[PDB]
Design a protein around this ligand. Sequence first.
Ligand code: CLR
Ligand code: CLR
Ligand code: CLR
Ligand code: CLR
Ligand code: CLR
Ligand code: CLR
Lengths: 175, 175, 175, 175, 175, 175, 175, 175
Amino acid sequence: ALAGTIIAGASLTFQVLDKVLEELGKVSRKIAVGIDNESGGTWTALNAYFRSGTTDVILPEFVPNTKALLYSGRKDTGPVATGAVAAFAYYMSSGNTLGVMFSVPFDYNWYSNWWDVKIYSGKRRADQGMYEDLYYGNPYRGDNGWHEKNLGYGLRMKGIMTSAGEAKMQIKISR
Amino acid sequence: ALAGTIIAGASLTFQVLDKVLEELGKVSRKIAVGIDNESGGTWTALNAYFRSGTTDVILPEFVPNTKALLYSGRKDTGPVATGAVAAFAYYMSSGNTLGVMFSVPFDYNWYSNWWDVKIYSGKRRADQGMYEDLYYGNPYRGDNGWHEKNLGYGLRMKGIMTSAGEAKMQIKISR
Amino acid sequence: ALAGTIIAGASLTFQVLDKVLEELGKVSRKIAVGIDNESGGTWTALNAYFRSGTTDVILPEFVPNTKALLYSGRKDTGPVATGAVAAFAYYMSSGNTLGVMFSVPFDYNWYSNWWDVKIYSGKRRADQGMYEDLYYGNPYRGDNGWHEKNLGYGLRMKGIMTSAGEAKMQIKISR
Amino acid sequence: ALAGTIIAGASLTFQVLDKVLEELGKVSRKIAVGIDNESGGTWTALNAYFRSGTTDVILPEFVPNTKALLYSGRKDTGPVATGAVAAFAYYMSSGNTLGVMFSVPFDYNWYSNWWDVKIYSGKRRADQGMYEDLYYGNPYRGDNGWHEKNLGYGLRMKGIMTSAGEAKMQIKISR
Amino acid sequence: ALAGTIIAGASLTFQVLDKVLEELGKVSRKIAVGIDNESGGTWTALNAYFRSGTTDVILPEFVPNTKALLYSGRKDTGPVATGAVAAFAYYMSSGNTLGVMFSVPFDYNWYSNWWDVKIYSGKRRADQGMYEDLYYGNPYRGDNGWHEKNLGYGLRMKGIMTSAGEAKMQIKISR
Amino acid sequence: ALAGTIIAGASLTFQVLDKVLEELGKVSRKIAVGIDNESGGTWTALNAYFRSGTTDVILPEFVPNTKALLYSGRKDTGPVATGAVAAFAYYMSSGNTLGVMFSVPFDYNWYSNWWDVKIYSGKRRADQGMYEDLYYGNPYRGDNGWHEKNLGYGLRMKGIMTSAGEAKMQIKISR
Amino acid sequence: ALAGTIIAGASLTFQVLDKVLEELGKVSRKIAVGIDNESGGTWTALNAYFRSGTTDVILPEFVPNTKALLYSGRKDTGPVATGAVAAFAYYMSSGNTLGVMFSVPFDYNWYSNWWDVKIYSGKRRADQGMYEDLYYGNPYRGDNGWHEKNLGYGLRMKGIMTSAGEAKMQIKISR
Amino acid sequence: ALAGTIIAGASLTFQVLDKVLEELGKVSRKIAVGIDNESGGTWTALNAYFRSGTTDVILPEFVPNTKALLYSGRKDTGPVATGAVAAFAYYMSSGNTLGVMFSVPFDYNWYSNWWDVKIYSGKRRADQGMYEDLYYGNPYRGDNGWHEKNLGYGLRMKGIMTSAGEAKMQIKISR
Ligand SMILES: CC(C)CCC[C@@H](C)[C@H]1CC[C@H]2[C@@H]3CC=C4C[C@@H](O)CC[C@]4(C)[C@H]3CC[C@]12C
Ligand SMILES: CC(C)CCC[C@@H](C)[C@H]1CC[C@H]2[C@@H]3CC=C4C[C@@H](O)CC[C@]4(C)[C@H]3CC[C@]12C
Ligand SMILES: CC(C)CCC[C@@H](C)[C@H]1CC[C@H]2[C@@H]3CC=C4C[C@@H](O)CC[C@]4(C)[C@H]3CC[C@]12C
Ligand SMILES: CC(C)CCC[C@@H](C)[C@H]1CC[C@H]2[C@@H]3CC=C4C[C@@H](O)CC[C@]4(C)[C@H]3CC[C@]12C
Ligand SMILES: CC(C)CCC[C@@H](C)[C@H]1CC[C@H]2[C@@H]3CC=C4C[C@@H](O)CC[C@]4(C)[C@H]3CC[C@]12C
Ligand SMILES: CC(C)CCC[C@@H](C)[C@H]1CC[C@H]2[C@@H]3CC=C4C[C@@H](O)CC[C@]4(C)[C@H]3CC[C@]12C
C-alpha cells in the first residue's frame, strides 16, 4: 500500500525534524560585556545595533567615571542558526564616541569570536556601517588573550574576550 | 483497507497538530514598562487600550511627581498568533494627557517592535484612534537605542525600547 | 476485519478526547476583587450569588470604614466551559446595600469581561435578579480603564477591571 | 483471528478503565469547619457521625468559651463516588447539645452543599437520626451567604458555607 | 498463530498484573496512638503484639506520670492485603497491666476500625490471647466518637479513634 | 515465522525480567542499633562479622561508660535475596567480650527478625562461630517486646528489637 | 522477510545492550580514607598510584602532627568493570615512607576488599611494585574489624576498613 | 515491501544515532587550575591558547605576590570527541614569562593527562609553539603525584595534577 508507506515515512520525517529543531533550539550563543570607565568623564549611551541576536536588558543610560558598564547579548530564541553580533556606542564627555563591536557566531566551523573597540570623532550612533568598520577592519580574536592599544585622543584600551559560545568580554578604557 | 489508512493518517495528523499547537503556545511576547515622572505634578491614570494582548496588573491609579510608573503587557494565553500592542493614557496635572504606545508583534519577519510618546490637549482616553495616531505616525523602533524629543508644553521625553520578544521600555518625562 | 478497524478508531477517539478534556481543564478563569471602603461606616456582608463558578474563601463578614475587602472567584474545576460570574451584596451602615457584579466569561469570542457597582435601597440580598440588573443594565467593560460615577446617597465609586481571563478588579467607594 | 481482536479490545478496555479510575480518584470533596463559641461556657465533644467520608483529625475534646473549634472532613480515598457528609455534637455547659450538619456531595448535578445548626435537649449523640433531622428538615444552602437564626435557650447562630467542592464553613454561636 | 496470540495475551496479563500490584501497594493503613498517663505512677513497657502489620518505632520504655505515650503502627510494605492490628501492654506501678488494642483493617467493606482498653491483674504480656480478648469482647468502634468507662482499680479511661485508614487514637487514663 | 515469535517472546521475557529485578532491588532490609553502656568501663571495638549484608559506617572504636553505641547494617545493594545478619564484639574493660547478634532476613515467610546478647570469657572476636552460637542458641525474637536477662559477671541486659524489615534495636547493658 | 526479522532482532539487541550498559554504569565503587598522624612529625605527600580508578581530589600536600589526612578514591566513570585500587605514599619526617594500600574491587564474587599499611626505608614513591608488595603480601581484609600491628621504627598502626562497595577506611599511626 | 523495510531500518538507525550522540555529549572533560605565586612580584596575564576546548572564565588579569591564580578549562559543548588542552602565559615582574600547559584528553585509551611548567626569556605569548614545546618535551603525567623541579632564574616549582577526566591541578611557584 503506497499510502501506508507514505504515512510511515511522514511519521519518521516528523520524528527526525522534531529532534533536529529541538537540537537547534538548544544551541546557546550569548555574551556578557563589562567595560571599566577610567576616562575621566561620564559616558552617555547612544544605542546598540544588533546585526544578530537581541538583548534582555536596556543599554544603561550612563556610565560615570570610575564605574563599570554591564551589558549582555544573546542569539534569537528558537531553532534559528544565528549568533549574537552587535556594535554599541557611548558618547563620551570629551566629545567623541566609543564604539564597541562583538561577534559570537552560530556556526563555529566557518566563523570565530571577534571584538574591537574604536573612537569615532563627534557623536556617532551605532549602525551597520560601524559594525562593518569594526568587524571588517582589524578586530581582535576572542582568543582568551589580553590586548592593548592606544585608542587616541589621550585614551588607551585593554581588554579580553573568551572563545566560548557563552562568551565573556572585559575591557578597561583609560586615560 | 481504506479505513485503516485513514485512521493512521488521522493519528499522524493529530500528533502533528498537537506539536504545532504546543509550539505556538510556547511563543512569548510581553513588555515591561517603566516611566519616570519628573514633570512637576501627579499623573492620574485614564485607561490602557490593548489592540493586542492583555495584562496581569491594573493600570496604577496615580504616578506622583519624582516617582515611577511600573506597567506591563503580554500576549493572549494559548496558541494564538498575536502580540502585545497597546496605548495608555495618563492625565497630567498640567491639564493635558500623556499617551504612550508600544507594539511587540507576534510575527517578527513582517513586523518589528515599535513605541512612541505624545501629549494630547485636555483629557483624552486611549482608544483605537490614539493607537493608530501613534503607530502610523512617526514611532520609534524598539531598536535598543535611546531617543530624545521635545514633547511640547514645556515637556521633553527620553527613552528606549529593546528589540526582544520579551521587551523592556524605559522612559523619562521631564520639564 | 471490521472489529479491528473499530478498535483502532475507538483508540484514536479516546486519545483525542483525552487531549481535548485535558485542554479544557487547563483553561483558567478567575478574579481577585479589592474594594476600599471610605463610606464612613462598617459594611456587613449579606451574600454572594455566583451565576457561574465558585470561590475558595468565605465572603468576609465585615468591612470596617477605611478598610478594604479582599474577595475572589473562579470557574468550576474540570473541563466545564463556564466562567466566574457573580454579584455580591454588602449591607452598609447607612441603611442601603452595595451590590457588585463581575463577569469573567469562558468563551472570549462571544463575551467580554464586565463589571458594575450599584446601591439598592434597604437590605437587599444578591440573587439572579440583582445579577441580571447589573449585567443587562449599563455595566462597565473590563477594559483596563478607570471609571467614575456618583452612586447616589452621597456616595461615589471609582474602579477598574482588567481584560484578562485571570482578572483583577479594584474599586473604591467614597463619600 | 477472534482471539487477537479480543486481546486488542481488552487492552483498549484496560486503558479506558485506568483513565476513568484515575479521574474518579482525582475528584476532591472536603470541608474545613470553624465554630466560634461565645455561649458563655465550655463545650465538650460527644462524637461526629459521618454519613459519607471520614476525617484526618480527632474531634477536639473541648471548646472553651471565647475559643474556636477547628474541624474538617473529606471524602473517602480512591475512585469512590461519595462526598463528605456528617453531623457532629458538642455537649454545652448549659446542659444541651449543639448539633452541626454539613453535606458536600460528590455528584453536583443532583445535589448541592448544605448545612445546618440546631440545639437538642439534654445530652444527645450524633447519629443517622440527627443527620436526617438536620438534612431533611430546613437546612441552609452552602451558597456563599451569611445566615442568622435564633437557636433558642438564649442562643443564636450566624454562619456561612461556601458552594465549592472544597468547602469552608464558618459559624459563630452567641448568647 | 497460536504462539503469537499467547504472547499478546501474556503481555496484556503482565500489564494488568503490574497495575494491580502497584494499586495494592499504594493502599495505606496506619495508626498514630497517643495515651496520656494521669494514673499517678510510671508505666513500664512490656511488649506490643501485632496481629497484622509492624512498626517503625520501638515501644517507648517508660511513660512517667503526667507524660504521654506516642506510638504508631502500619501495614506491611508491599501489595499485601492486611492492615495494622495490635495489642500492647504497659506494666503500671500499681501492679497491674494496661492492655490497649487497635484494629485498622485492610478490607473496609467487611471490617471497620476498632479499639479497646482494659486492665489485667498483675504483669501480663500482650499476645494473641489478649488481642482476641479485646477484639472479640466489647470493643469500641473507631467512629470519631469520645468514649468513657471505669477501668476499675480506681482508674477510668476516656478516648477516641477516627474512622480513617490513616487513623488517630487519643486516650487518657485517669485516677 | 518462528524467528519473529522468538523475538516477540524474548522481548516479553526481557520486560518481565527487568520488572522482577527492579522489584527485587527495591526490597529494603536494614537495622539501626543503639546500645547504652552502663557497665562502669570503656568498651573497645573488636570487629563486626556480617553473615549477610554490609554497613555504611565503621564500628565505633570506643564506647565510654554512660555513653551509647550507634551502629547500623543493611542488605547488599542490588536484586540479591539476602538480609542484614551480623554478630559484633566489644572488649569490655572488665576483661570479657560483649557479643551482639542481629538477623533481619530477606524472606519473611520462612524467617523472622532475631537478636541476642551474650558475654564471652576473655577477648573473643566475632566470627561465624559466634553468630551460630547466638542464632542457633536461644535468641529473642524481634517481636516489639522488651526482654531482660542476667548476662553474668555482674552484668544484666534489657533490650528490644522491632519486627520490621527496617528494624530498630535498643539495648542497655547495666551493672 | 529476512530483513524485517533482522531489524526486529537488532532493535531488541539495542534495547538489551542499552539496559546492560546503564546497569553497569550505575555500579558504585569508592572509598573514603582517614588517617590520623600521631607519629610526632609532619608527613609530606609523594604520590598515589591507582591500579584501578581515579580520584576527585589532590593528594593533600602535608599532614602535620596530630592532624588527619582525608583522601578518597573511586572507580572510573562509565560502564567499565573495574574498582578503586591504589597505594599512596607519604614521606615522614623521621626519614621513612608510609605506604598505604586499599583495594575495592568491582566483581565481588571473585575478590574482596583489602587494605594494608607498611613503612619503607627512605624516600619511596608509590608504584605498581609497592601495590603488589602490599596486596600480595599479608594484607588485612576489609572485614569491618579493627586491626593492630607494630609498624617498626617505633611506630604502630591501628585501623579498620568496611566490607562495602562504598567503603570507609580509618587508620591511626602512633608512636 | 522494500520501502517499508527501509523505513524500519532508518527508524532504528535514527534511534541508535540519537543514543550515541547523547552519550558522546555526556562525556565530561575539564580542569580546575590553582597556582600559588610566591615569586616575589606580580604576574600579568598574557593569554591562554587552547589547543582543545575553551573556558567559561577570563584569564585573571593579575596575580599579586602571595596570592593565587584560579583558572579553568573544559571541552567543547556537544558530541565532539575532544578534550581540554591548553597553554597559558603570565608575564612575571622579573621580566620573564611563566608558561603552563595542561592536557585532559577525550580518548583515554590512547592518551593520558599531562602537564608542565616552564619559564621563557622575556615576554612570550602562549601559542601552538609553546604548547608543542611543553607537551612534546618532558611533561609530567597527571598521575596524582607531587613533582618538584628548579625552574631557573632563581625560581622553583612544586605541583600535582590528578588523573581524572575532571582534573585538578595545583602548582606553587617559589623563589
Ligand atoms: C486535516 C484537518 C484535521 C485540518 C484541520 C485544520 C487545522 C489545521 C486548523 C483548524 C483551526 C486552526 C486554528 C484556528 C485558530 C488559530 C489561532 C491563530 O491565532 C493561530 C492559528 C490557529 C491555532 C489555527 C491553526 C490551524 C488550525 C488548527
Ligand atoms: C468489560 C468489563 C471489563 C467491564 C467491567 C465492569 C467495570 C466497568 C465496573 C466493575 C466494577 C465497577 C466499579 C465498582 C465500584 C465503584 C465505586 C463507586 O463509588 C464508583 C464507581 C466504581 C469505581 C465502579 C466503576 C465501574 C466498574 C469498574
Ligand atoms: C495467568 C497467570 C499469569 C495468573 C497468575 C496468578 C496471579 C493472578 C496471582 C498469583 C500470586 C497472587 C498473589 C499472591 C499474594 C498476594 C498477597 C495478598 O495479600 C494479596 C493478593 C496477592 C498480591 C496475590 C494476587 C494475585 C496473584 C499475583
Ligand atoms: C529464558 C531466560 C532468559 C531465563 C534466564 C534465567 C533468569 C530467570 C535467571 C538467570 C540468573 C538469575 C538470577 C541470579 C542471581 C540472583 C540473585 C539472588 O539473590 C536472587 C535471584 C537472582 C536475581 C536470579 C534471578 C533469576 C535469574 C535472572
Ligand atoms: C550482536 C552485537 C550487537 C554484539 C556486540 C558485542 C557487545 C555485546 C560488546 C562489544 C563491546 C563490549 C564492551 C567493551 C568494553 C566493556 C568495558 C568492560 O569493563 C565491561 C564490559 C564492556 C562494557 C563490554 C560489554 C559488551 C560489549 C558492549
Ligand atoms: C546510515 C547513515 C544514517 C549514517 C550517517 C553517518 C553518521 C554515523 C556520521 C555522520 C556525521 C558523523 C559525526 C560527525 C562529527 C562528529 C564529531 C566528532 O568529534 C565525534 C564524532 C561525530 C559525532 C560523528 C559521528 C558519526 C556521524 C554522526
